[PDB]
Structures are given as C-alpha cells and as structure tokens.
C-alpha cells in the first residue's frame, strides 16, 4: 500500500527551525490524499499541524500561527514541514500521515521522528555490559543486561545478537538527567545455553554516528 517515512534532523537549537521530510512510496502525492503533519507531545497529547493535499492546497493549525510552512516536491514524491522560532515546547514526535481527501480513510502514518529542541550538546553513549552475579546463574533461566549511559539526544537503537535474539527482551524507556540520557535493556535466556551461546548488545546512536557491540562476558574466568 502507501508507505510514509519521516526524515530530518532530530536536534534543533532554540529559536531556529525544525525541517522534516516525508517520503511517500506506493502512491503518487498528486493523487487523492491530504498529506498531514501531526505531532505527539511527551504528555501524549496529539496535535494536528496541517496538510498539503494532492493538488498543492494547504491548511494549518492556527495554534502555530505563521511559524509553519508545508511544501511538496512532486518530482521527488515528497512533502515537507518547516517550523520556525522553535522552543522546548516544540519538543515532540513528529508524524507525517496521509488521509484520503474524500472520506478521511486509509490513514497511513510514517514511523514518527523525535525532534528535540535544545541547546544541549550531542554526546555519544558508553555501553556497559551487565553480567549476572554467579549465584544467579544456577537456575533454569538467566538474565543478562546492557546499560546505555550518558547520551544526548534521543534516540538510540538497541538489539541483541544483531536482532536474532528478540524473545525475552525488555528495553526500558530512557531517563533524562542533566541533559544526558540513560537506558538499560534486559535479555533472559535458558541458563544451559549461556555462556556457550554468546550474547551481544548492539547499540547505535545515529546523532553521534556511533555504534558499540558489547559482548556480555561472565563474571569469573572468561
């Protein structure tokens, strides 16, 4: 069907502009739809920002009064969001979403892109392995961990064994302190399988272009 994918910078300085792109595939943007920008606040309140429709005609929320431009490039099958004069109050997840002009149906949203409005600096994380204490390995299951600490801004991506280990995983929401984030993730497996089958935390921080692949080593001889 039609698919949308947002791209654009995830960290913007106060009083500058946010600039995002929505790339549409599986459908021509000059047919049938209204191409909308919607944002979700940390609270989780959703706000409609505006649209550009298949003919180029636009509309936006008066709450944004004059800060917002919505444009398209038909040769590229893309539409765009520009929002100026930003403040921390514009920190949110931005979604592009197409709805059929005719009946509001077929709602299709991109993945969502987080935009942080902050003067804080981009910092790569330290990824620390969380190896189980000896006494906790003699059970039928064993739980291993990975601590991602001191990064900015969100987000990071975290997988286990490059994504082949997906069952029994818990990745927790990041916690922000002093303009650095900390995230942890746990993975539980059959005790007999470890450490014969190694377990590695794969962490990416696109903002700082940094990746760490941390093999979890047991406590005791390795």
């Amino acid at each position: 069907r039609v698919q949308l994918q947002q791209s654009g910078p995830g960290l913007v300085k106060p009083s500058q502009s946010l600039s995002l792109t929505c790339t549409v595939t599986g459908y021509s943007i000059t047919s049938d739809f209204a191409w909308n920008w919607i944002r979700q606040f940390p609270g989780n309140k959703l706000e409609w920002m505006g649209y550009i429709n298949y003919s180029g005609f636009t509309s936006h929320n008066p709450s944004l009064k004059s800060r917002i431009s919505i444009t398209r490039d038909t040769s590229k099958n893309q539409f765009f969001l520009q929002l100026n004069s930003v403040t921390t109050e514009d920190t949110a997840t931005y979604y592009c979403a197409g709805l059929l002009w005719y009946d509001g149906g077929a709602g299709s949203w991109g993945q969502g892109t987080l935009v942080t409005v902050s003067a804080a600096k981009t910092t790569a994380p330290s990824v620390y392995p969380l190896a189980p204490v000896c006494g906790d390995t003699t059970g039928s299951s064993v739980t291993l961990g990975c601590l991602v600490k001191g990064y900015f801004p969100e987000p990071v991506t975290l997988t286990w064994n490059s994504g082949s280990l997906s069952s029994g995983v818990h990745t927790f929401p990041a916690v922000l302190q002093s303009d650095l984030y900390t995230l942890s993730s746990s993975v539980t497996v059959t005790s007999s399988t470890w450490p014969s089958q190694s377990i590695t935390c794969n962490v990416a921080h696109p903002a700082s272009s940094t990746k760490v692949d941390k093999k979890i080593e047991p406590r005791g001889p390795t």
Binding site: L130, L147, T188
Partner: protein, 219 residues
C-alpha cells in the same frame, strides 16, 4: 475549536471480554454532504497511531472486524467484540469536520490478567564503568502483574534512596505483564567503600519482598 472528550480515561479488560469506549465532541460532526468525519485510532506501545474506524461507522482498510464504531451528531462509541492482548494501547478519536481538526485525549486499554510476581535480577557495576569513576548498580523487576510495585535499595543493610532512577515498560502484549528497571548510581569511590548491595521489590503477589543482593569483589 471542537473539543473531543473520551471516556473512560483508562479501561481494564479480561481477554475474551468486550470493551466499549466513548468520544463526545463539542460540535456535531455531520457535514453538508452527509458524511461524518469521525475516525478512531489505536496506538500500540512504541508505534504510531494506526487506523481503525472512519466515517463514524465504517471499518477502515484492513482492520479486524472485531472493531465497531457507532453513534452520530456528537456522541460516538467504539466497541471491541472480544479483546485480545494485542489490542492494548491507547485509543484515540479524531474529527475532520471542523477546522482545525482535533483529537480526543485518548483512552488506555489495559489487559486484566492473573497476578504475577516479578523476576528480580541485580547487577554490579561493570569493570569498564568502574575505570570511568562512576558506578551504576542495576536491578530489573521483570514480568509482574499488577503494575504497582515497590523497589528499595540497601547498601550494607541500610536503605539508600539518593541517586536512584527508575523506568517502567508499557504492558507487554505477549503476556500482559509489566517490567521495571531501577538504577542506583554512585561515584566509584563510594561503591568501592561498601560491600553489600541489595535490591528489594515489594509486590502484592508476596507478603515478603523479593530480595536480590551481591557482595563487591565476589563473583
């Protein structure tokens, strides 16, 4: 602007049971051509909202027929004939009839299930973090139900509450449980000063807390 009011705030439903939620708009949503631009959306944990219902009463493209939308004028209802665990998340209504378009505040659908005690796991600071001069002790409290749970930290038998940071997961659709992570962060020098580190979880499933401990400098 049109105000959309969703009730109830939160609903907790047993798998296999029905669920009904309401959206009431401050203005009628019928239009001049006979269409009613009222949509319902579901947002699962970690994803974007996705379509359910449109035109007030119509099933959107590819949606399971377990969802039904009813109502007109200003009062709308979404019903789920039989709830499945994957239906958990936040449900929103949306109006496209009056500019500017607006969303309900959302209704969170939670799955009711059998109580479950947490699996508690504690982790000393890593050797790499210790070379950094910082030391985090991590405790996971995994797969419990219900969602209310306490965690207390002890150092050498004495409770510590400073430098503690917690983070909870959304309900898991696989088993309908909750997980939580707690992190106690110290300087390497304070960590290296004490021996015993203890994580204690208190959950309704147990009259006695779940306790996990370790000694510094011991495997």
């Amino acid at each position: 602007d049109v105000v959309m009011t969703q009730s109830p705030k939160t609903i907790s439903v047993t798998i296999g049971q029905p669920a009904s939620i309401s959206c009431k708009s401050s203005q009628r949503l019928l239009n001049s051509n006979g269409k009613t631009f009222l949509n319902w959306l579901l947002q699962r944990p970690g994803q974007s909202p996705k379509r359910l219902i449109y035109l007030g009463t119509k099933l959107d493209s590819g949606v399971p027929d377990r969802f039904t939308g009813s109502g007109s004028g200003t009062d709308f209802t979404l019903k789920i004939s039989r709830v499945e665990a994957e239906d958990l998340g936040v449900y929103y209504c949306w109006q496209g009839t009056h500019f500017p378009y607006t969303f309900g505040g959302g209704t969170k659908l939670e799955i009711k299930r059998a109580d479950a005690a947490p699996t508690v796991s504690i982790f000393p600071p890593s050797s790499e973090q210790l070379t950094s001069g910082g030391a985090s002790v991590v405790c996971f409290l995994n797969n419990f139900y219900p969602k209310d749970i306490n965690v207390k930290w002890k150092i050498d038998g004495s409770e510590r509450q400073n430098g503690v940071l917690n983070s909870w997961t959304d309900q898991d659709s696989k088993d309908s449980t909750y997980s939580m992570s707690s992190t106690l962060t110290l300087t390497k020098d304070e960590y290296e000063r004490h021996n015993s580190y203890t994580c204690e979880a208190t959950h309704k499933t147990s009259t006695s807390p779940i306790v996990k401990s370790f000694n510094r400098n011991e495997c």
